[PDB]
Amino acid sequence: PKKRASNGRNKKGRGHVKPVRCVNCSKSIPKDKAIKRMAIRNIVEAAAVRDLSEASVYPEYALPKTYNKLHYCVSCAIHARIVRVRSREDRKNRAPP
Amino acid sequence: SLPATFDLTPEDAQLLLAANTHLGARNVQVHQEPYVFNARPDGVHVINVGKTWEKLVLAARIIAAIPNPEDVVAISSRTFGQRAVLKFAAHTGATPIAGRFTPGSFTNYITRSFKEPRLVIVTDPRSDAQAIKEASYVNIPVIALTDLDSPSEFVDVAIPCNNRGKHSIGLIWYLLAREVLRLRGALVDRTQPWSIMPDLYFYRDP
Amino acid sequence: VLVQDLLHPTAASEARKHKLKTLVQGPRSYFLDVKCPGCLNITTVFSHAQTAVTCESCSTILCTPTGGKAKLSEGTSFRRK
Amino acid sequence: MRAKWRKKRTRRLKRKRRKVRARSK
Amino acid sequence: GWVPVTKLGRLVKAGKITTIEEIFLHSLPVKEFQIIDTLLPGLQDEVMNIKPVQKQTRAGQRTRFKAVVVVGDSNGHVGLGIKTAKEVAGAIRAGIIIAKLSVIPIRRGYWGTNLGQPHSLATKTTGKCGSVTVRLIPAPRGSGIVASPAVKKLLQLAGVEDVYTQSNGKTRTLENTLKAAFVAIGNTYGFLTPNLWAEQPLPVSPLDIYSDEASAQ
Amino acid sequence: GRVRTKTVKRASKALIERYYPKLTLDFQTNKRLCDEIATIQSKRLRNKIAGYTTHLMKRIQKGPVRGISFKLQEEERERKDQYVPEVSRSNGVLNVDNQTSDLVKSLGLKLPLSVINVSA
Amino acid sequence: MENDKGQLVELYVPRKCSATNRIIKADDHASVQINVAKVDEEGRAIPGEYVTYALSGYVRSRGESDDSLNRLAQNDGLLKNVWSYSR
Amino acid sequence: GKGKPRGLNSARKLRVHRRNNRWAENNYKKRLLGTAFKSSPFGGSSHAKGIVLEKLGIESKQPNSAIRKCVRVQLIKNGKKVTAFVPNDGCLNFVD
Amino acid sequence: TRSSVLADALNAINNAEKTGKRQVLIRPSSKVIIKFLQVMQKHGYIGEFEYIDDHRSGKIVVQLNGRLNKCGVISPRFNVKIGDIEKWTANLLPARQFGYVILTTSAGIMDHEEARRKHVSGKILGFVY
RNA sequence: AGGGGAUCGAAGAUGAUCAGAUACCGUCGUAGUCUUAACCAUAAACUAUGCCGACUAGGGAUCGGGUGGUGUUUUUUUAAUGACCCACUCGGCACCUUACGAGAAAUCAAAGUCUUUGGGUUCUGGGGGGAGUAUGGUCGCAAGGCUGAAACUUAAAGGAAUUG
Ligand SMILES: [Mg+2]
Ligand SMILES: [Mg+2]
Ligand SMILES: [Mg+2]
Ligand SMILES: [Mg+2]
Ligand SMILES: [Mg+2]
Ligand SMILES: [Mg+2]
Ligand SMILES: [Mg+2]
Ligand SMILES: [Mg+2]
Ligand SMILES: [Mg+2]
Ligand SMILES: [Mg+2]
Ligand SMILES: [Mg+2]
Ligand SMILES: [Mg+2]
Ligand SMILES: [Mg+2]
Ligand SMILES: [Zn+2]
Ligand SMILES: [Zn+2]
């Protein structure tokens, strides 16, 4: 039977959203049924930061991070990203952690 | 049967405002509470403490009136109510329950927590909700110390109060024990400031 | 709740209800008399304008309309009745 | 067999019986 | 020897309560089956239905045995025990015990006239357990109990001389039907008929009048 | 890994329950107690039992321990009960909100009057 | 529940809830009877004398047992204000 | 009120609508379509008397295993051919 | 839109009793509503009620005791002929010793035993027990 | 039927993978994808939940309208505004907790006020398979759409929940 009150995800009072393509497998998928992870990560990394300023002009420079929004397909979101799977009760909890 | 001067006196009115028993819950208000008196600006609702004293008199009026005073159960699982109920229990008949309730106490004769009271008194029907639920299986009346948010299901005779902390619990239980001795009891005449100190209640420290 | 007086409700909680949900419904809108000391006499205005009301003799202004009670213009006074 | 394919099965099956019949029209 | 617990257990052995109608009057819950033994000796049981049920365990298979028992006199007291245990006899033993604790009264009545000794029901009652509704209808004297043999015995023990019945649901599941007929007769005493409008004073509890002659040691 | 079974920790429970005014924090004497006071079927179970009732004994002397209340502590806490003399009619007057005082004049009479306003 | 000639038949006239006038029946084990004892001159709660109220398990479950008790007691005179018939 | 029109003047709709749904009843349909008289080997008659054509051993269905010994019969009022079982051990030696 | 003003009255009264209240505000009353509420009250199933006058169709505040299990309206007003009142009461009444079907005769809105005494018949309004 | 034809891409052809591999992956790429004029009338066109009306229960957010304030933030000289805060009220999109109540359950502020069975009205279903098949009519350029049987077969098919 019915396994979710939000059905797939988060559509009430619309009837049509518009699809986005999945970053991983390219599968089209509704925007509100997708699963989005903001990717904000520094350009460099853990390691290269010390050797950055060491080889760099300017005091301390700036360090400009890169921001890109990720869109996953379920099946691709399941294969890696936010999934696990949850118990019948633990599913309900929309808390991010 | 309105007695005479069992009215709320300034000796007592001062006591209550001292512990902030009149300072009620914030935005949260159960629709079951006329016990309000206007509302303070910025979040707080003022409790009408005559209706508190008048209820506390009625709780006292029921507590005494149980033929054997020793089965009238005071209960707090809250830490702020344990020092109070033990100090309520000692002064009156009142078998106490502090700390953990151990569900199955009012059903299940087999348990070693087993009680069978003709009355029950409770500080916080949220924290103590197990006790309220368990008594409602066996036909057991329930007095309750209730704030403006308290779950009034299965509590008769609620005493509007502040369970947000501090001396209110100790105060209400100090007056509750005080007024059941003033009823039928070994106590005394009118003003009677009553030798025992009110800070003898109050969960202590650290 | 569970028992109360529906025949004689409190005047405070009757005051907050919608004009159709009172015990016997009636309007919440009032009439007022307005003056702008250029003019000696006073026109009577409905609190909710629609029309932007001009005074007796001179074309001046009184209130512009809104989604609601009319904003009265600038220097003016009003009584209510 | 998938209902959709089972439907396409008889869609075809009908257009053919449609054919053979009209050859006798 | 008995040796009770529950202040209500003492007060009955203490000889301070003659009848269970006292217990019902005050809605006192019964936890000790000997209470309704001394209070109602003439209880005769009936073992209504026994059927196997089966659980699949991480080692093996448990097939235990479910039994359904009905006790009553026939004066207006019945009870519905249902118990499952891994032996037919053991489940019947514990089931008759639960049928004891469960006993509830019945308001009988007259079909159409005020004559001797009510043979029928006060009102129409329905009750529904699971998918089954069993409906009980007032019946003229000598109409008998019109019900399937299961429901008939539960009604006969309950003391009913003449009643009409109708059922709706999957009635071949014997367990839900009796629990429904039980809820049906159990509802006769929740029904406010004009003769019960007269105000009573509100009697005083046996747990108080005899309070000293009860409680603990 | 030495973790005492329930039969050991269960028997130590009932022993410290009723025999506390006896025993000690010395294992050796407690061991000999469990002979004269209790019927055990083997020397090993008894040293195991007595050894743990010694431990439960050893820590009851500092702080209570869940599972054993011999009724002696509950009236040790009753005779331990007192605190106070300060309370909480000084100094000056009770500082109340606006409506708190309006609550006074509504049902009330003389009260020390100190009022404050606050804000958003 | 009388019979042909006069005789009370049909055992056990039940209690009644004090708020709702609805029968309280045997298997309602969520019901309650609150005993409020009468007082006398200068304190003194008078054992063995009560003004009693019986509240059905229904009302208790619906959260009305408290406010409904105020109306009941205050109307019998053992409360002075606390309860307002208007809202 | 979910569906059925409750008005006092809705009788026509009520019988029309019930007249309709009786066709979902298998028996009402069969009896009005005259399927008895139209289809079926007997005319709708209680019995019918034919003539034996061949003798068949019929292979029984699972999970049985047997040979059921019937007779092909041509109904005399019909010419309709019908296969019919011969009960009771032997009795195939009773026909011809 | 409102197809029986009696209907919404009786329903709201029943949701009072079921929810354990002592009073109910019904709208927009009517002549038929009143004489229904009277037949109940004169056998005691409700208390005093008050017509309030809005300049519209009216309102009523009914006080009810709790002796009332159900009141309900038969929504098509069927015609009853004097010997079919037997069949109506028998269908929807809890038992032959109490409770009434109340109907509308040319002799006015009256319960079924008053109808049996006055020997008039008519359509059927509702029932009360 | 014109136009457009960047992209992606039924078909087809390929490189691989496979025992095979008419596929999944890679490549090429026709139709298509966009637009105008005209057809077609179907989707799990889904909330798998007709519409109008009434009644039955709490809670905090929020979208739109409005009302109230010797509220905050905006400085200028106070305002006026605007954005904000707090209370109430309509009318929305939803969530939360309750369960009086309903249900076979999952669950449900309706899926409640239902054997204590009647507010008004429309529609569809009557075991499974046969089969949305045959046939007739009708619409369409076509693909197909609406309407839509029976013979025969058959003791289950099915729903939710439980333990494995
Ligand atoms: Mg599935
Ligand atoms: Mg859609
Ligand atoms: Mg040809
Ligand atoms: Mg059987
Ligand atoms: Mg059909
Ligand atoms: Mg052949
Ligand atoms: Mg012929
Ligand atoms: Mg290809
Ligand atoms: Mg190839
Ligand atoms: Mg493969
Ligand atoms: Mg379709
Ligand atoms: Mg402003
Ligand atoms: Mg078979
Ligand atoms: Zn993907
Ligand atoms: Zn002017």
Author numbering:
A (entry chain D6): 2 to 98
B (entry chain S0): 2 to 207
C (entry chain D7): 2 to 82
D (entry chain Q1): 1 to 25
E (entry chain S2): 34 to 250
F (entry chain C7): 2 to 89, 95 to 126
G (entry chain D1): 1 to 87
H (entry chain D3): 2 to 97
Would you copy out the relevant sentences from the publication that reported this structure?
Ribosomes are one of the most conserved molecular assemblies, and at the same time they are the target of many antibiotics. Amicoumacin A is an isocoumarin antibiotic that was found among secondary metabolites of a number of soil and marine bacteria. Amicoumacin A is the universal translation inhibitor since its binding pocket in the E-site of the small ribosomal subunit is highly conserved. In contrast, it inhibits eukaryotic ribosome movement along mRNA during the elongation stage of protein synthesis in a similar way as it does with bacterial ribosome.
The structure of the amicoumacin A complex with yeast ribosomes was determined by X-ray crystallography at resolution up to 3.1 Å. We prepared the crystals of 80S ribosome as described and introduced amicoumacin A by soaking at concentration 200 μM during post-crystallization treatment. The amicoumacin A molecule was located in the E-site of small ribosomal subunit after manual inspection of the peaks of positive electron density. Amicoumacin A interacts mostly with rRNA residues in helixes 23 and 24. It is involved in stacking with G904 (G693 in bacteria) in the tip of h 23. The antibiotic is located within the hydrogen bond distance from 2′-OH of ribose of U999 (U788), oxygen of the phosphate group of U1769 (U1506), and from Watson-Crick edges of nucleotides A1005 (A794) and C1006 (C795). Otherwise, the conformation adopted by amicoumacin A in bacterial and in eukaryotic ribosomes is very similar. A small shift in the position of 2,3-dihydroxy-5-aminohexandiamide tail can be attributed to the absence of mRNA in the present model. C-terminal amino acid of yeast ribosomal protein uS11 is located at 3.6 Å from the isobutyl group of amicoumacin A. Mutations of uS11 make yeast ribosomes resistant to the inhibition by cryptopleurine and emetine26. A conserved loop of the ribosomal protein uS7 is located 3.9 Å from the isocoumarin part of amicoumacin A in the bacterial ribosome and is more than 10 Å away in the yeast 80S structure.
